[PDB]
Design a binder for these strands. Structure first.
Length: 99
DNA sequence: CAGGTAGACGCGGACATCAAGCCCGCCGTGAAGGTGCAGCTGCT
């Protein structure tokens, strides 16, 4: 209704980027791409794809690139002791990651 | 078996200008990606 055209242009830019990247002109591969992108089967696939976690304070993959474990999105409390401090808890509001 | 005592060692003034400082061509490639799904053989 209001912002439907924005996400429609988003899927269309994705489709035209895929067509310019592949550039296959055999057996209607562009038609098989337009069969998925121009309809809302892309929205069903985007609803299907699960695995994102939105975790910032914990990311295990820097320790090893294949280390399946638990990732967390939780900031600690502020400590009581003076001097040392970490995890930027005062200001300059954070940006989150996706694992 | 032996071999010396003593006291002092100078001043002055000056130390140069000129002009320039090269061109050319080129700098290696190879290996260092997870994850999820479909489908194929082998087995009970």
């Amino acid at each position: 209704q209001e912002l439907r055209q924005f996400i429609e242009s988003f899927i269309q830019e994705r489709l035209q980027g895929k067509l310019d990247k592949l550039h296959p002109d055999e057996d209607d591969k562009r038609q098989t791409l337009l069969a998925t992108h121009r309809r809302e089967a892309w929205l069903a696939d985007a609803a299907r794809r699960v695995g994102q976690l939105q975790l910032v304070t914990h990311t295990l993959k820097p320790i090893h690139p294949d280390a399946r474990g638990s990732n967390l999105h939780s900031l600690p409390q502020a400590p009581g002791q003076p001097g040392l401090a970490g995890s930027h808890e005062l200001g300059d509001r954070l940006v989150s990651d996706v694992v």
